[PDB]
DNA sequence: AATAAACTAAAAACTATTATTATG
DNA sequence: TAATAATAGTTTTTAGTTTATTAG
């Protein structure tokens, strides 16, 4: 919406509390068009997770997407633009996310 | 039966919670009770309304009363409300926004309780109020005692324990061990609706109702509703016999039920299809009496239930069943009944083994006075393997395994074991409310316990091996 | 996986042996086709005019006609045996039909895999018989290894019937022995007990478990003798084809909002966490489930046998643990242990689990000693949720309903008379006056009769109710008369009122 | 109306959503007559009525599990009555099926319709609407339904009385039009039934009036045999008019428009009678309006 | 190289109402 | 020629129909 880069990029804020509460993260992601989805949607690029809870451990046990610490979403928001995957926030991540880590950073 | 016990959490704030301080342990008690209730009964309603407060937060706004989660079906709302305050830091923040011990009139809080119990619109069999205090907190009490007595007349029960059975002196007249309340009770469904009583065709002129209520039988996980994967809202699941060669959904005039038997699909109609299920009528058609000696008891293996009368449809249920169970002592037989729960049902040959009332000192209705369903098998389902009885008992072996195992003598508490799936997922629901891990595991005690201590009790089967190869692998 | 049973049917119309034999063979085929039992049967008729056997020994087999070769029982065979076979005009030797049928079994068995060979023979014995071909009849009987199971018309036998019985008995004692005479039964009456139901079992093979106390167990998966279940679910068929063309189910998952639908992925099986439905799926169950203890048949504890409750029985088999495979120490230990536990009454709580895909369980362990099989019984025991308990009016303490005492002696004599199962004798004779454990139910057999009705004639919708149980599911008139005076006291002293569940005519039919 | 009719026609093509207490009458509501009748419900009427008759034969049949189906019957009759407006009158076996189904609907009186439970009267009304719609067997099950209608019109519930009278007289019109040869014996038997119900006294002021009204209806069926035969009783009708209609008390003064029109129907053959029926005409007009 | 089935598949519960026949 | 009466109806927990490999 405000920054359409998060539009068409579904950020599954299903349980995010590391930086901001999950309702607040969902509100801000919809403020930029990231879809408020409670289980990774078809467009979910990465699950914006939070404190290591039942949902975060669901994502860890069932790697549908990453366990993204909402600090990665903070760096995305402050830039007002989707910041690529970084091996410094997402504790648990999809193999494509580790591949991105190796793509634009070292191991 | 509509009607349960409505419970409210009327907890005093007279700094009788603040001396561990009684507040934290009381909050653990109430949270554990709510954890039990959310997994047991939403029909029972829970009211987180505390008094003694520094605020007048209540409907009529009386002295030193606070409302947190009024009478409602249990849920994570009260769980989190008490969780934010359970800790000692939780206790101090609680005392910050709620308040500390203050003065008030107990008539006020009892009036608020009366309003709460008279505002709910559920036919409620019982009413209960819990209360916590370190010691006896106390005109101020005479009106309080009068109002408490009146509430007791209204079916309201009062619960209080002094957390100093030592010091509740000023409250002994006022009043009408919480380790059990610390989630000892948990996850027990409370439903009282079930099938209409069946008609026992005991003879050819009088039939008697039998009370078969599947109300306290097996309980399992909550209903998995096909919520939306995005917003967690269910779907309607439009499903039926639909068409592809002709398209759309087939109409009942176009649907025929057949049976593929012999060499052809024997096409019948739906009317014949569902009217074939009957051999006679609904009820317990009694053929006669079958001696209990003629029970396979290696085929009495399916899910079995109880057979109780029902002194509601016929006057003679209680009468004739009392006489029958009085004379069951001299009988080694069972009421040989055919069982149809409703119309168009294939009756099953049922032996009614007399399971009479085990009225203890308190006359607890364990094995209520009636009969237990004995399985009379048939010839289509048992995992039979060929018999081999060339092997009998040998004195050395029987003595050795006897000394190995005879020490472990149990009593078979029928409800001792815990269902893995049921309690597992119910406490997992508790954890979901807590937003935490898998809390704890339920199991039908399927890990053996004697094998780790049979040698501790002096096992000889391990000591005496019949072969260098494991004698029974 | 096949049984090579064989039939040998047929002055002949006179009770009449022919009608009884036709009844029992129509029974046989109808029972093998209702459950779709796979036991091929051949049929050669003696007396049916014409020496047209597939294998005739010089055509001396006068009036011998083959009906069916060794072929599976289907509705086609059912109707063929029902209709084609008619009594012959001039007499014939049933031993000739025996030779032809045995030769058919030889031809089929030598070339095809047959796991069983039998000869279900029902000869009316009223036809003139010649006993001169003993060598070839015994040759035919013994080459195909078909167990000659001959049955008698009635011993209610005429001179022709007597000589037929003696020739068949001598040929079978040269073949098998007096076992044939033991199974020789009257076509009606003695064979009528078989002529009312079916013997049936479900093909499967071993699916083992592990009695893991400290140990394992050797078992197998089958479905042989246990309470009746559905044979085949009602195969819904199109009114246009009577097959499966428009008989299939769709999924739309109409998102309950509102006509918007959902796909298979678009549903998450949210669980009703009391006040709210938690968004829950099997991925959530991964951290919210319990893992089973493999395929363990273990035992968790040992209890006194007195505490067990018949009402507290659950499961769907009993692991009748017999002598173990290739482990004689296992066999002796098992027998001694089950007998010693019976002596101690120290029944074990079988900590069972079907497999990792299923859930772990408890059980019971008490040995069932019988005339043939004497070993352990495993039935699952209740838990805190399986407390099958009924809350109603108590019986004995009810002084409000405390009836008379002539009723008590009435009930005692009624029990003595309605004991509708013979008490076990010294010969382990588990006799039942109304056998229930082995003889089937009355409504699955009702379906069998209805499907016979609709297969023999698709315009025959519904036959009379299956009296298979009804005739034998009633107390004898003697015991009812004995209790009548007790019943007189019961009815003259017990007060009660009417009941409900009154199913009347659904509409206003022409009456 | 077409889109919603199609939506609900697809809606009713599913399973297990029917269970409710009164919501089943949705189908009764689905039948529509205020529509302009495009091809949508024109085509769907066949499927709906086929389903209706099939499930009536299934449920309504004497059965063990199902002892009744009130919501089922009500919704089916509502939709059929409101949608059988499409002329399916003499085509094929559907006439037989629906006729015998209405017959077995209104053959017996299990429900207490005299006490305001007039669902059988609703069935009577639906049949009266669609008696001509299903005529391959109304000539078969014709008497017993007619006397059952007589009892229904003799019941305490005045709604039952009017509904049964309307259905019975509509059926009388049907059989008079398409019976008439063929119904010579049937016409004579109906004349005998008349004789019994008209020449004998009757406590109902409308019983003999509708008897002679059927005479007028059967003036055609007798006319193809002998209209002079009932013109012979027309003289008896003259006796009735000259004696009891001018004795004023007389409830046929209140109830002889049926008599007047029936006399016209039977007298279509005759031409001459001297000014007899005009004192009666004014008399019955005065005590009719 | 095909036998193996515990992955749920449905029906009474006292709610309570109308509906009586309230009047010539 | 004008009230009270029963289909009026439910938070239907088992119809006993899906998990489970040696048949070749």
UniProtKB/Swiss-Prot annotation, chain A:
Portion of the full-length sequence here: 654 to 760 of 911
Family, per entry: Belongs to the ATP-dependent DNA ligase family.
Protein name: DNA ligase 4
Residues annotated as domain BRCT: 1-90
Function, as annotated: DNA ligase involved in DNA non-homologous end joining (NHEJ); required for double-strand break (DSB) repair and V(D)J recombination. Catalyzes the NHEJ ligation step of the broken DNA during DSB repair by resealing the DNA breaks after the gap filling is completed. Joins single-strand breaks in a double-stranded polydeoxynucleotide in an ATP-dependent reaction. LIG4 is mechanistically flexible: it can ligate nicks as well as compatible DNA overhangs alone, while in the presence of XRCC4, it can ligate ends with 2-nucleotides (nt) microhomology and 1-nt gaps.
Entry comment describing in which tissues the protein is expressed: Testis, thymus, prostate and heart.
Secretion signal span: none
Lineage of producing organism: Eukaryota, Metazoa, Chordata, Craniata, Vertebrata
Location of this chain's protein in the cell: Nucleus
From Swiss-Prot, chain B:
Cell location: Nucleus; Chromosome; Cytoplasm
This protein's name: X-ray repair cross-complementing protein 6
Induction of expression: In osteoblasts, by FGF2.
Cellular component, GO annotation: chromosome, telomeric region; cytosol; DNA-dependent protein kinase complex; DNA-dependent protein kinase-DNA ligase 4 complex; extracellular region; ficolin-1-rich granule lumen; Ku70:Ku80 complex; membrane
Cross-link Glycyl lysine isopeptide (Lys-Gly) (interchain with G-Cter in SUMO2) per UniProt, renumbered positions: 226, 256
Main location: nucleus
Modified residues (Phosphoserine): 245, 416, 459
Gene Ontology MF annotations: 5'-deoxyribose-5-phosphate lyase activity; ATP binding; ATP hydrolysis activity; ATP-dependent activity, acting on DNA; cyclin binding; damaged DNA binding; DNA binding; DNA helicase activity
Function per UniProt: Single-stranded DNA-dependent ATP-dependent helicase that plays a key role in DNA non-homologous end joining (NHEJ) by recruiting DNA-PK to DNA. Required for double-strand break repair and V(D)J recombination. Also has a role in chromosome translocation. Has a role in chromosome translocation. The DNA helicase II complex binds preferentially to fork-like ends of double-stranded DNA in a cell cycle-dependent manner. It works in the 3'-5' direction.
Signal sequence extent: none
An individual GO BP term: negative regulation of DNA-templated transcription
Record organism: Homo sapiens (Human)
Residue positions, PTM N6-acetyllysine: 256, 270, 277, 400
Curated annotation (Swiss-Prot), chain C:
Modified residues (Phosphoserine): 216, 275
Residues with the N6-acetyllysine modification: 131, 223, 289
Subcellular location: Nucleus; Nucleus, Nucleolus; Chromosome
Start and end residues of each VWFA domain: 4-191
Alphabetic keyword roster: Acetylation, Activator, ADP-ribosylation, ATP-binding, Chromosome, DNA damage, DNA recombination, DNA repair, DNA-binding, Helicase, Host-virus interaction, Hydrolase, Immunity, Innate immunity, Isopeptide bond, Nucleotide-binding, Nucleus, Phosphoprotein, Ribosome biogenesis, Systemic lupus erythematosus, Transcription, Transcription regulation, Ubl conjugation
BP GO terms, sorted: activation of innate immune response; cellular response to gamma radiation; cellular response to leukemia inhibitory factor; DNA damage response; DNA recombination; double-strand break repair; double-strand break repair via nonhomologous end joining; hematopoietic stem cell differentiation
Induction of the gene: In osteoblasts, by FGF2.
Similarity annotation: Belongs to the ku80 family.
Protein's name in the database: X-ray repair cross-complementing protein 5
Record organism: Homo sapiens (Human)
Taxonomic lineage from the root: Eukaryota, Metazoa, Chordata, Craniata, Vertebrata
Curated annotation (Swiss-Prot), chain D:
Processing after translation: Autophosphorylated at two clusters, the T2609 cluster and the S2056 cluster. Autophosphorylation induces a conformational change that leads to remodeling of the DNA-PK complex, requisite for efficient end processing and DNA repair.
Each HEAT repeat, start to end: 140-175
Domain of life: Eukaryota
Role summary: Serine/threonine-protein kinase that acts as a molecular sensor for DNA damage. Involved in DNA non-homologous end joining (NHEJ) required for double-strand break (DSB) repair and V(D)J recombination. Must be bound to DNA to express its catalytic properties. Promotes processing of hairpin DNA structures in V(D)J recombination by activation of the hairpin endonuclease artemis (DCLRE1C). Recruited by XRCC5 and XRCC6 to DNA ends and is required to (1) protect and align broken ends of DNA, thereby preventing their degradation, (2) and sequester the DSB for repair by NHEJ.
Clinical condition linked: Immunodeficiency 26 with or without neurologic abnormalities: A form of severe combined immunodeficiency characterized by reduced or absent T and B cells, recurrent candidiasis, and lower respiratory tract infections. Some patients show dysmorphic features, severe growth failure, microcephaly, seizures, and impaired neurological functions.
Similarity comment: Belongs to the PI3/PI4-kinase family.
Protein name: DNA-dependent protein kinase catalytic subunit
